[PDB]
RNA sequence: GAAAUUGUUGAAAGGGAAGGGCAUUUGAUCAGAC
RNA sequence: AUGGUGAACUAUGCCUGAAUAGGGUGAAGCCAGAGGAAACUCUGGUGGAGGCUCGUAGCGGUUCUGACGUGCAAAUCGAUCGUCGAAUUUGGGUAUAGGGGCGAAAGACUAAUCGAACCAUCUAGUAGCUGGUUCCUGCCGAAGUUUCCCUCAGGAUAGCAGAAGCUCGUAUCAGUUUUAUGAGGUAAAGCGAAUGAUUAGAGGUUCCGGGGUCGAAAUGACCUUGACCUAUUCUCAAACUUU
RNA sequence: GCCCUGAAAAUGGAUGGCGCUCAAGCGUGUUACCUAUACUCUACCGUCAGGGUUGAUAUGAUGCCCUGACGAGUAGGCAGGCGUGGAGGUCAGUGACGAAGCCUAGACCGUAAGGUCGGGUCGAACGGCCUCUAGUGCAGAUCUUGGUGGUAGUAGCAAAUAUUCAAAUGAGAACUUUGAAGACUGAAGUGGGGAAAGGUUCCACGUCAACAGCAGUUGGACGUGGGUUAGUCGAUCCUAAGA
RNA sequence: GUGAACAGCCUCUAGUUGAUAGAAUAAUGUAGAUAAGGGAAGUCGGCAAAAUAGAUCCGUAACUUCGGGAUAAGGAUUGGC
RNA sequence: AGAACUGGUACGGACAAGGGGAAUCUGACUGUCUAAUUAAAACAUAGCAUUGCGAUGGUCAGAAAGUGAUGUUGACGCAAUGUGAUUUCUGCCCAGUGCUCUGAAUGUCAAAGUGAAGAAAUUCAACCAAGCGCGGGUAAACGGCGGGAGUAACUAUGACUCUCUUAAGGUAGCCAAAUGCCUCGUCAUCUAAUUAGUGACGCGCAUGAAUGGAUUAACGAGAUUCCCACUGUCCCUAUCUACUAUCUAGCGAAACCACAGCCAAGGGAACGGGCUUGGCAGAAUCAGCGGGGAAAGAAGACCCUGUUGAGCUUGACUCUAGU
RNA sequence: GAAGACAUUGUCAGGUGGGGAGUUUGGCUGGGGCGGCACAUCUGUUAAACGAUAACGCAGAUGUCCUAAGGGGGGCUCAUGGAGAACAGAAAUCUCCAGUAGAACAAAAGGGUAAAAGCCCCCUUGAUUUUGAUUUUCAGUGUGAAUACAAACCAUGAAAGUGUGGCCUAUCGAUCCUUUAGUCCCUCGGAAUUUGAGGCUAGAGGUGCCAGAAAAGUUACCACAGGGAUAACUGGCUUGUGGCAGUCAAGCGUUCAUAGCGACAUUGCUUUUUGAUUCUUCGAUGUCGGCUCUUCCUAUCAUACCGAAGCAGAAUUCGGUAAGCGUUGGAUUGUUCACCCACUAAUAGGGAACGUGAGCUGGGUUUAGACCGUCGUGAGACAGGUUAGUUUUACCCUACUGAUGAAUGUUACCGCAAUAGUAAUUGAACUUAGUACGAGAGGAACAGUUCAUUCGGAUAAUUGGUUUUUGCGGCUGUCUGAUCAGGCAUUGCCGCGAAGCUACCAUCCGCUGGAUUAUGGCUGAACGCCUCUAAGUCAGAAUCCAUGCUAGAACGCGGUGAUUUCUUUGCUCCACACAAUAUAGAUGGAUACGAAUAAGGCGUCCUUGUGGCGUCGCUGAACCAUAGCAGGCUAGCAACGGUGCACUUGGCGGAAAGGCCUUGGGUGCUUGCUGGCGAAUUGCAAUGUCAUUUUGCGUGGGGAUAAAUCAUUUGUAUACGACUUAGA
């Protein structure tokens, strides 16, 4: 017999299975479509989630109640030092999908990048690209052939970059390596662009520009094993239920004499890879720029880092991207920032966002002051002071 | 000093049972006859 | 059915013991005072009654239909709860014994056993009902049908089957055809044939159907309706039929 | 005539499936080819039937031989055989130079029941044949008694607030002893005595195979012993309900 | 000792420190709890839980077998010195 | 008992410790019972009422007895019943089934005893105890309280009158009550909305007087309705603690088990793990889970059958203790 | 003292006697009960032309009736119609004609019957006596009925003859007992007589459950052996009924059959009603409802796009593609159902063992307690009402959710993408616009903007919740002599309280291309016209497939880095040296345009094309290769070609290129032609061994000198594994 009353099902069936991701760095499964008319540019970037903070800005949209009037807003800061270009890969178009024809690497690789190729770095002769470096030191013999291989073939060209994880306060010491597809033109000069950028850093301002919609790709915060009530949002069973109430009462009919794949059940929650879209960049901060957190309306010399530092992350001495809202992943997590895959006017994505005030109060409590100078003025002199 | 049941060694087979029948290949072993 | 054993659990009586904070309320009896046309009424003390009451120990066992539910436990555990000075609680002694006890009465309890305890014997109690019923090969090979039965899940009986054969040796034979001779009432057919049913008009007769017209009426006449008769017409029958 | 509309049901799915469009569909016709335990021939087995052959030697005349036909089977009937315990007869049978039993993807016979042999183990009895006799053959009866698995190194060993440090002993210490620290019962006690009941559980010494669902050097365990002193405390006497 | 109290809580005498332990802190359980705004809409049903609660002062209805109802209902106070 | 002062308005500071109100049904109350699914409206109870009996007795026990209980008793008692405090009331019916009384009896009637016939066994006849039958009493015995006809000046109805069955015809009260089918009865009230609730209306299938009727303060771990307060019951969930579950050392079971364990459809004992046609199909596994294994727990307690029972009842059949 | 031969005591007899005892309280049967009798029977039919033949199949009948309605005989002819007669008519009685039964013969019906079998008159008991045979049913038993006889005694009639009950087919009863008639016989057993009794043959009393016990209920306190031979769930066959849908078109609709409806008929579908049945299940598949959750169907309520109107607008009605997406909060009731209140775009219908009880609950139903009404004498009964009433077990397999993991030389990093899944949804306000339209009333829509509902995925800056941060403070009781500082009160209590977790109770985000359905069109035949259709084709829906999003096949794949010698000489590549290993199956060559097939291939020519001319196919049965000891050893001739082999020059090919072409020289052979030598004996065939897979051990010649795991450690992770970090 039918349900006596209707209700939408709990949870989304397109995000199945709710298993753990295969890696801590979510993979980019689609890059922006290429038109061979623009200059050569990276389409993505690698950064670390620093934390949340609060922004005040003047909303500008006609027809709204809050037009030309203040709105307090929530943003998240992603810490983005420049990425070092080491290597390039060509992809031939085959009837069985794209396939990497060959990889050409740079002559010199730092320590922090070659640590990626090791499980035990403290036990090593460290033997990394030692015989590959001998491919260089010739005039024009070796490297140019595989480079010309990517010229003659490989309709898709991607660039291997590694993050400067030593500049961030993270205690990892082991960089993150990824392919970022080049979406310039004339794949021959895509290969040329990667050639003279070997061992050279690409800053975030050359990829993302302020007031842009970008994509955040990261692995979500994990919560271990979860009951069905929280994992799927099912209704809680009544109080006087024998043998538990954080369950699903009927997990199937008599026929088919099986449990279907679509019935909510207990298991892993979180640590999924997600691609959230349409996040607007509110600031492209400069690492070597005092008063990162300042604004034309504030004009007070203060960096983006709140008093006491970003909770569980540290400080933002490097460049950063301030993007509106919330993104998948927790603090200290590697996050990939991707360009929008389509063009949207939307009367909301073309708005020019000009900040007015950035919150720098402590996130380690009910923060009261924005700067140590502000705290000293309000309170006065203390007994600690001499 | 049996069987169920068990250990060790040896041999063989095993993609959601195993076991069986006809026929033969292959491997192991063997009687007769000269 | 016979003969025994149990009131160490529990039921009720009797005998002899034993146990039961601290509060609330404030009955009779008693003292003093006040108002008083008397009569009498009122007030404050005192006192400490009640199968009274809140609530411990105790005795109990309402709800969570909680825990447990191959338990700690063949009835327990937690919380909540009833009663708590007596128709109270309880020990020991003793009385009551199975168609019998005891019962503030639930068919309750009478040793985890009760709408008739337990033990042994009669007793291998009876069952048209359930289950099982042990080696091989060869040859043959059924029935669910008849009649009777308090007969319908059973028997008896005939039949179907096997075995032993017996007397004879191709015949007093045959789940067949032919010839000759009978019997039958089904299929079909039939209703201008009996019975019954059933459509339509045509022609006739009323001293004797009902009506309208000319008539006082006529066994007077005219038009119509009903039956009646004749020759037709359409359609039928398991309990209709010549064939 | 074919095709289409008419033509709506619940897990995904059924010309058997793939798939097939002058078909690999439908109607129709003509040949070729495939294959049943069916039909023809042959061999072999048994059963039934009809016959031949005592003649001397050689023993089964219930024997040997010739001919023909036939063979499914539940319940059931009949017949011929295999095996077991024991008894009469006989093989002047086998055997401590190894009987019986047990084990053996080694050999042989029989359609089969079964029979025989070889090898290992073992240690004292046992068979062939003709007969006699029966407590004579198992896969099952929620069969009886005994034994053993998968489950499975699994459920579990979570009520009662709580342990820690060090030394001693020992093969071995979370658990024994001692010290120290931290706690609890909180006087209707986790204290000190008894009644009923138990019977040595009391105490010492030695001691850990078993029991204390971990452990164990410890124990209400195990082995060996010691220990209960009345004129006054009880019984002993009286009587009660009763016997 | 607190306190009306052989209540509940703490301590003295006396006696125990007995119940397999160790490591982590997933889901779901058992037991104990707290929740913004709403306040029975939940459910057969307020089942469960919550609220009230000691004492002192004030005040106390219908009805009544005149004994009760009654701690009715409803207010105030509460430490230390 | 009172007064100052004092504090982050706190102070029965932990512990301890009534939620309250308006109503309906029902039992008066306290008390008792189904040990181990029912604590109740059940039982008890006081009070009320009835019945039997003066001892050669009532009631009861016993195989029997020179036997017993009440009884060491004596109607202000003993035995047997019904109802169930108080208040109020307990209406009509003795035809029936009972029970109980007169016996004034051509009714019936045993054994014995008597008479006649007989040759006797025997047959016949009259007579005849208790009992039945006949005739009275009794309902706080068991119980019952129905039709019909004619009538009042609008109809309707019947204060009045008569009549059968079979004796009487339901009075005082109470009711969609725990007793009403129809029924979710109709009206009012309560709600935004009520098959609930309360108050009313009645030819009431089938209310009703110690089968007790009605009312009723107090009480109730009894059934029900609503209001205030209060809250995680809920909107709609979230978080925390202990012990588990989890991993380890030691110790270490049970249920159950034809063989086993992937589906779809088909056909099939009409719902397959196995069969057919398909889809498929990769070792070894861990924590969860409750779809399935028509999972497990019991030779269905329901139904039916059986010439199988038992407990109980009675104008069943056949007997019997006692009297 | 009382009583007194009465009580009492003993035996026999009558009444009373559920206090007690034992027992019984039919059968068939579309389950049982109620009902009925299909139980003993009879007629017609079913019944299918001998006989037989079932059903609780159809129309009925019997437990009797008759001294004549039995037996014999004689005479007459019936029902009815027509015509006539005083009262007298449709029915009185009388006359004639007609009249095959259309009457009667007890009853039920069917046969039969006309000088009778009918109606009237006469006589009588043949409805008698004796035992046998036979038919029916059948067992060739009994019982009943009957048939024809034999031996007596009669009736009637002139006589022939008829008469052994009823014109035929129903109309009935064993054993034991009692009783009667007959025989007046046998026996009473030590011998007699007489009563009495027992025997012998024929009747009567009766069993209707009728081949034949002597028999009341109840059980909700219950028991046993069984039954799925038999009911109450599901499921299966069926579909009357329920529900849904068609065809026809008399009519309604002012007018007008079909805008919307639609009578009388009729044809279907479904299994969400209820029936009918009894196949499975009674050594048990847990029978209401709700809650929870998933999925499926379409007969579509809303949302998308459309067609038709009795569509001016608005609102609405009919219909199509469509199940992508939604379909609620409540009062009462256990309720399913129902009925109201209210919101909403809408509050559609259903299935999944009437889904879902080792998921819950337990309000209802349906054990045992209890009350009432009604019924019963009673025990008790009631699909009447009411109140209280134990809801057990997963640790196994599979499924599902998550999680590891051997083996693909090792190890590490970066990737591809087969397959599977998928997602967004709906409303409001402003403007368009008081506009279009309409006499007026009234009154839209596309485009645009701002928000909101339902859903989903994350996240913690802020706000709120949570407190063992037992972090700070405060307070009570007690304990530590007081102070300070602490313990205990199972987290003592209270206020605040960071971090983490977390709330539509907080915030953010949720994409655009193609192909289509219905539908509306273009060109254009069929059908000289016309037509959206046939060929061809355009636009088009919340639809499908893509983009995008999640996982990554643990037996799908690519690129890249490093690859161990003093673990006692290890690893890799190259040449041969010998072994082992195995074969989804060499035995001359897998021999390369593309495109069309109502058209092409090749050759040639020009003015280079969609060109002209010529030729070819009609199968690869082709082309190439192919002679020599399983293919030997030598000689010459002719040309300077052919082939194999190791080197070498230069290119081309990345879809899995791993192969193709080419320059130069050397070398072997050459069957292009002509000579010389050898073969035997494997005995007359025996595959008669000539291929390539992998691995190992040796040489000699180059090439290069790593990691991973455990353990420790971090928390961006976590049940354990696993993950992510760090450590010379
Ligand atoms: Mg005066």
CB burial string A2-35: b at 16+ within 10 A, e below = eeeeeeeeebeeeeeebeebeeebbebeebeebe
Which of these, A243, A163, A154, lies nearest to A202 by C-alpha position?
A: A163
Residue A255 Cβ < 7 Å to strand D:
yes
Residue A235 Cβ < 7 Å to strand F:
yes
> Cis before residue A70, ω within 30 degrees of 0?
no
Beta bridge partners of A178: A161
**How far, in Å, CA of A171 to CA of A266, rounded?**
34
CA separation, residue A169 to residues A1, A3, A81, A313, A318 (Å): 60, 55, 12, 7, 10
CA of A97 to C1' of D28 (A): 55
**How far, in Å, CA of A73 to CA of A55, rounded?**
5
**How far, in Å, CA of A358 to CA of A158, rounded?**
37
Query: For residue A224, which phi and psi values (nearest 5 degrees)?
Result: 65, -155
Ligand 1 centre to CA of A217 (Å) is: 116
CA of A247 to C1' of C67 (A): 21
Residues A46, A83 contacting (CB under 8 angstroms): yes
Helices vs strands, H then E, count in chain A: 5, 14
The conformational region for residue A29 under phi > 0 = left, psi -120 to 50 = alpha, else beta, is alpha
Ligand 1 centre to CA of A322 (Å) is: 112
CA dihedral (A327, A332, A338, A339) in degrees, to 10, reads: 70
Residues A62, A111 contacting (CB under 8 angstroms): no
For helices A187-196 and A143-152, the axis angle rounded to 10 degrees is 150
**How far, in Å, CA of A31 to CA of A335, rounded?**
15
Strand F: which nucleotides have any atom within 7 A of a protein Cβ?
A: 232-239, 263-264, 271, 273, 287-293
Residues A58, A357 contacting (CB under 8 angstroms): no
Beta bridge partners of A33: none
- Round the CA-based radius of gyration of chain A to a whole number and report it: 25
Name the DSSP letter for residue A58: E
Which of these, A127, A87, A128, A133, lies nearest to A107 by C-alpha position?
A: A133
Ligand 1 centre to CA of A377 (Å) is: 99
Q: How was this structure determined?
A: cryo-EM
Which helix H or strand E contains A143, and what residues bound it?
helix A143-152
Which of these, A151, A141, A285, A121, lies nearest to A210 by C-alpha position?
A: A285
Specify the 3-state DSSP secondary structure of A229: helix
How much of chain A is helix, strand and coil, in % rounded to 5? 15, 30, 60
Q: Cα A325–A343–A187 angle (5° rounding)? A: 110
**How far, in Å, CA of A359 to CA of A53, rounded?**
6
Residues A94, A156 contacting (CB under 8 angstroms): no
Ligand 1 centre to CA of A295 (Å) is: 110
Q: Closest nucleotide (CA of A100 to C1')?
A: G559
Which of these, A84, A88, A86, A85, lies nearest to A103 by C-alpha position?
A: A88
Beta bridge partners of A174: none
**How far, in Å, CA of A91 to CA of A103, rounded?**
9
Q: Closest nucleotide (CA of A253 to C1')?
A: G355
Beta bridge partners of A83: A163, A202
Alpha-carbon torsion (A48, A51, A52, A53), positive or negative? negative
CA of A374 to C1' of G206 (A): 132
**How far, in Å, CA of A57 to CA of A96, rounded?**
50
Residues 6+ apart with CB under 8 A from A375: A307, A368, A369
């Amino acid at each position: 017999s039918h349900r006596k009353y209707e209700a939408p099902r709990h949870g989304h069936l397109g995000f199945l299975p709710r298993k753990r991701a295969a890696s801590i760095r979510a993979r980019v499964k689609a890059f922006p479509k290429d038109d061979r008319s623009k200059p050569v540019a990276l389409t993505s970037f690698l950064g670390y989630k620093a934390g949340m903070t609060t922004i005040v800005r003047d909303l500008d949209r006609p027809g709204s109640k809050f037009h030309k009037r203040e709105v307090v807003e929530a943003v998240t800061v992603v810490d983005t030092p420049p990425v070092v270009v080491v290597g390039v890969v060509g992809y031939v178009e085959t009837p069985r999908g794209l396939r990497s024809l060959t990889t050409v690497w740079a002559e010199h690789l730092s320590d922090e990048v070659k640590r990626r190729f090791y499980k035990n770095w403290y036990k090593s002769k460290k033997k990394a690209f030692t015989k590959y470096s001998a491919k260089y030191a010739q005039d024009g013999a070796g490297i140019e052939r595989e480079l010309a291989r990517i010229k003659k073939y490989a309709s898709v060209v991607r660039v291997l970059v590694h993050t400067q994880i030593r500049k961030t306060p993270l205690a990892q010491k082991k960089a993150h390596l990824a392919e970022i597809q080049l979406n310039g033109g004339s794949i021959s000069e895509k290969v040329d662009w990667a050639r003279e950028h070997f061992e050279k850093t690409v800053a975030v301002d050359s990829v993302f520009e302020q007031n842009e919609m970008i994509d955040a790709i990261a692995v979500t915060k994990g919560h271990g094993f979860e009951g069905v009530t929280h994992r799927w949002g099912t209704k809680k069973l009544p109080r006087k239920t024998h043998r538990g109430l954080r369950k699903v009462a009927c997990i199937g009919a008599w026929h088919p004499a099986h449990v279907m794949w679509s019935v909510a059940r207990a298991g892993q929650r979180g640590y999924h890879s997600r691609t959230s879209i349409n996040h607007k960049i509110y600031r492209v901060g400069k690492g070597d720029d005092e008063a990162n957190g300042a604004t034309s309306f504030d004009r007070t010399k203060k960096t983006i880092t709140p008093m006491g530092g970003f909770v569980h992350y540290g400080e933002i001495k490097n460049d950063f991207i301030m993007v509106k809202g919330c993104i998948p992943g927790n603090r200290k997590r590697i996050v990939t920032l991707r360009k929008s895959l389509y063009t949207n006017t939307s009367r909301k994505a073309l708005e020019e966002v000009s900040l007015k005030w950035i919150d720098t109060a402590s996130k380690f409590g009910k923060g009261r002051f924005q700067t140590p100078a502000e705290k000293h003025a309000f309170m006065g002199t203390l007994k600690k002071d001499l």
